[PDB]
């Protein structure tokens, strides 16, 4: 399951030429996690910059028990500066130099399971239809992996 993740978001970053891609886990209470990263050589990994780069404390999807993705739906970002974020949010954007971005919701079985997030550091990004449907299709199978990986997680419990 690392194993997936690892590979998930290694496809990502090279299909879309990011400078980062994440994946979020939600937990029973709504609150979450990154748990998983690809990132190019360039940036330092999100957990170092966490030891020592503060930033806004952000409950706003545990607050509304997964926001607009629990409804399906997705954020497609051209220029973080232009899309009229709170103050907070572009504020934790910009501590991690991200200037464009995309995060999709990841379902596992008919549950928002987590987020896949794709970010672009330094310039504005022109997003295109088929980057996103492709980052929707790597989100679904994601989904399906874990879905299975649960299954199988159940069976062997059961002998
Ligand atoms: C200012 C911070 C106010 C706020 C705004 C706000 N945030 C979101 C959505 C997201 N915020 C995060 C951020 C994190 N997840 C993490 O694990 C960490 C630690 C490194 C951070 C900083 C993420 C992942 C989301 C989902 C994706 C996104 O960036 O939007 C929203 C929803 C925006 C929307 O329209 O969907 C809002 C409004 N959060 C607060 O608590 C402050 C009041
Ligand atoms: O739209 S929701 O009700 O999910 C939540 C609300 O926080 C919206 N976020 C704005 C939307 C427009 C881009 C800047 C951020
Ligand atoms: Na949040
Ligand atoms: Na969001
Ligand atoms: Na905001
Ligand atoms: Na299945």
Request: aromatic letters at 12%.
């Amino acid at each position: 399951l690392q194993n997936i993740f690892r590979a998930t978001s290694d496809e990502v970053r090279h299909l879309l030429s990011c400078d980062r891609v994440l994946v979020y886990r939600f937990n029973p209470d709504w609150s979450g996690e990154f748990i998983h990263e690809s990132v190019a050589q360039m940036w330092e990994p999100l957990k170092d910059l966490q030891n020592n780069f503060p930033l806004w404390q952000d409950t706003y999807l545990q607050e509304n028990e997964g926001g607009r993705y629990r409804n399906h739906e997705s954020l497609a970002v051209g220029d973080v500066e232009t899309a009229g974020f709170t103050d907070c949010h572009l504020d934790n954007l910009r501590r991690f130099e991200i200037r464009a971005f995309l995060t999709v919701p990841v379902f596992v079985g008919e549950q928002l399971w987590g987020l896949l997030g794709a970010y672009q550091n330094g310039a504005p990004r022109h997003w295109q239809a088929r980057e996103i449907h492709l980052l929707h299709q790597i989100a679904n199978q994601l989904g399906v992996a874990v879905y299975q990986a649960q299954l199988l997680a159940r069976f062997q419990e059961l002998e």
